[PDB]
Symmetry: D2
Subunit: 226 residues, 4 copies
């Protein structure tokens, strides 16, 4: 049995990462969780589960979303395969403006449980067809550093690239396919990397000079381009 969880409106990707990590203890993920940006960051994730575990998953989820409140937040649950009506809503939510009403109507029609405009994102995140995506690895700061100046040093290094083998060593990259994300302010993300190749993300990741402890990091698949 498939079960999907969507959340929208600690930022969303932080909590969504907690959920993904916790639920992976009791259920088999289909894939990395997904970060769906409406132009917005809603998060969704899918697990293979048995009938008898729905309650446990539901309870866990609302348990964690609350502790990380114990310090608007739309949770959406769907059992089974994403039906065409929901996929169509997601594609629609990303092309144009959709109302909370349209969202309520679609959740009822597809039998989602909806536990703030958070429902629009929770729903769309669940239904988003990731035929096209990039990876986005996000590292998170320990709470002691939130609001503290970011301690991370970007050193200029060359990377390894098959396509450049025939070229001279000073060959220049026509495209930056992998990019660093450098947040600011109370945001709990320390640093992140976006790209389409996992090995290339690793190359970048290992080379980043990180002078403060990463609480944890999470790889997402996102409808965002590099």
């Amino acid at each position: 049995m498939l079960i999907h969880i969507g959340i929208d409106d600690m930022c969303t990707t932080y909590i969504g990462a907690i959920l993904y990590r916790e639920i992976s203890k009791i259920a088999e993920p289909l894939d990395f969780p997904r970060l769906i940006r409406l132009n917005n960051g809603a998060v969704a994730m899918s697990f293979k589960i048995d009938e008898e575990k729905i309650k446990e998953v539901k309870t866990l989820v609302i348990r964690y979303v609350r502790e990380l409140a114990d310090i608007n937040p739309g949770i959406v649950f769907l059992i089974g395969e994403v039906p065409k009506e929901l996929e169509e809503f997601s594609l629609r939510a990303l092309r144009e403006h959709v109302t909370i009403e349209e969202a309520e109507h679609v959740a009822r029609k597809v039998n989602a449980e909806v536990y703030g405009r958070g429902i629009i994102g929770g729903l769309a995140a669940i239904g988003y067809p990731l035929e096209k995506f990039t990876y986005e690895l996000l590292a998170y700061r320990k709470r002691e550093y939130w609001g503290t100046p970011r301690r991370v040093i970007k050193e200029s290094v060359f990377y390894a690239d098959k396509w450049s083998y025939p070229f001279t060593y000073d060959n220049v990259d026509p495209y930056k396919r992998t990019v660093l994300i450098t947040p600011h302010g109370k945001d709990p993300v320390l640093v992140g990397i976006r790209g389409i190749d996992v090995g290339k993300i690793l190359q970048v990741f290992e080379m980043i000079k990180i002078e403060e402890p990463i609480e944890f990091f999470q790889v997402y698949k996102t409808n965002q381009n590099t």
Copy 2:
């Protein structure tokens, strides 16, 4: 030791045989040298003269001359079925790579190409004062960072300009992304597409895409009713 070969036939009103000839070269030279990658098919101007082919081989110093000779011979043989060759030895230098990128994004002159060719020591074999030198250099110098695969099936000569015997069959393909979706599900993008030439073009049929697994699914499913000479996989700067 790297040797690169660029073929381009622009000041050849008509033509059509460029990728066909490039495929024969790739196939023949693989007999004696080690290819770096599939050959590359480069279009200079995406607004549709501007179609060139290149390829890169590893080889020992002793056999550079032999590669050049074989190439000249095959193009000669293949041409005399009723041209434009560039060679480059060693790594592709920054300037030739920069030239390639420039050619892909704006009009360049023959004088600019001669300049680059002399600076990087490319051999423009028996130049005939055409624009073909531009495509040959641009093809050699193109870095395959962004590209798509393009598989092209070639017709036997006896079939050229004959009615095409191919059946496009409407089937579903195996797509990982749609696993969590219901059977009846909108496919948002088509990332793999057919090329369907008409008339005397020697290409029977082609496929352009980003993933080789998906290219193979499509290719095996194509009903080919005529026997083909061969097919060749190219990487190209074009998109779907």
Copy 3:
């Protein structure tokens, strides 16, 4: 909804490929079809040793259409080649249960009985279509249940009927291929391993030539470089538990 089709008891891979191509017209395949060999010390011909399966996504409404088409297609193939009976067909609906997965693993590592196969088939509700009391049921169940965690690609090209049992018209001249790992190495350098190998059948076997490898790009390099003198009916890519 998921439907799996298994085939057992030459024409097995041929028939399986046709099944895979035809059902793709109406249902969404999960992956390339799978070719499952039960014993490496034994020939992947018949009987019961070499089997084929495939998995499709289809809506509840069309499940019966799939089964019906599969049977018609196998019936016809029997009619044409007049052999003249069906190879065994097995259907399973829904996910493959742990019981069937484990049977498939046990069948690859040890001898199993027809009774053991009947036992799992009843337990997981596989439909063994028109059973003929053979060992084929084992191969069909095993093929359906096999988890493709470890596998190898196998591209098989098939001959037109007129050419069957006619001397093969295919030539493999040596060429070098493009290999990333060889970049830092001098030109004169031999592979320590061959990861991609040719399959060259003989006699009346409908397979023209095949290729087994772990990498699709390399399979494609070897495939485009093969000189094929006779026309081929079609070719099919399988994933298999076999290795090079």
Copy 4:
């Protein structure tokens, strides 16, 4: 131009190797991840693209870092058949120090300062088959102290299991944890064949101490 660097000695080898790869990456273009070559089913090597002008700069750099922190082997140009063959031979059998220096001189390798067998074999090894090995390194202040790592028992995402039930059994473990003890500067490590699966595993590891850095290697070893 290609330059190759190989090190080996009679723990700190992959650590020093990682530092070299990281520093040289600042001035030269790596061909690939560094390679870890174990002669018994060890030695590190790496390959960078430079121009003639940078040879001394790289050599000088390497020599400086290894001493601040063992045989060093350098080579310029493509790896010749003779070195590759020695590399392959050094695995499947026993080779003498003398056999190694002979091979070194024949292929114009520079042997700075065993041990050389390992450096040479590392440089020359054809890794047509390899696994990825991700290694996380402790800060020196933590070496020889109790490890701050928690193994989290989780399910991972796998394509092949999509059509099986939830209670499906995983027939092979293709990705495995490396858990050293004692003074070893490696905090923890992961070996697998798929970088995607490596990342899944890496992100779930609960790391309770500040690590110096981590390095991905390619290695001849299997799981």
